[PDB]
Paper text:
Here, we show that high-resolution crystal structures of the mature-length HTLV-1c CA protein define essential lattice interfaces and identify a distinct ligand-binding pocket. Across the known Orthoretrovirinae, CA is a two-domain protein with HIV being the best characterised. However, our structures reveal that HTLV-1 does still have a pocket formed between helices 3, 4, and 5, albeit an electropositive one capable of binding to either phosphate or sulfate in vitro.
One possible explanation would be that a bound cofactor is required for appropriate immature lattice formation prior to budding. It is particularly striking that H72 is so conformationally responsive to sulfate/phosphate binding, while also participating in the trimer interface, and also being essential for infectivity and particle production. Mutants that would remove a direct interaction with the sulfate or phosphate groups (H71A, H72A, R98A and W117A) all effectively abolished infectivity with a concomitant loss of particle production. In the HTLV-1 case, sulfate is unlikely to be the endogenous cofactor, and inorganic phosphate is too ubiquitous to provide any spatiotemporal regulation to the capsid but could potentially function as a ‘pocket factor’. A cryptic phosphopeptide, on the other hand, could conceivably function as a capsid-binding cofactor at this site.
Numbering used by the authors: 1 to 125
Write the structure that this text describes.
Amino acid sequence: PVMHPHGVPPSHRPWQMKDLQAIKQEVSQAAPGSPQFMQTIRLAVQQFDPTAKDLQDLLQYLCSSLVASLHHQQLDSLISEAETRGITGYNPLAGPLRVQANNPQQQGLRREYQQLWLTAFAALP
């Protein structure tokens, strides 16, 4: 999660097991892929403002290894397509998008990464 304390720069903090349990319960209160599901996962992403690594770690906790890998596969294709067209605040010279999305200061890029990560569920059966 990325914290936004008043005044000081934003900072990253690891998931707490209670955070992940809370998200798991909220998500499990809706059928996977359903409109209420996608709404719940999006609201959880808003709550914790996670980095790219945070999002990967969350799915690793929520889903089976192969299903989380399927998401990663779908997201990688979305990222490639997004990189071809250009992404807000992304210069390939500063490193891979997934790595840049882990810099707490790059909010605009993190938020766009979050939207791509959310979009990649559109395939998850």
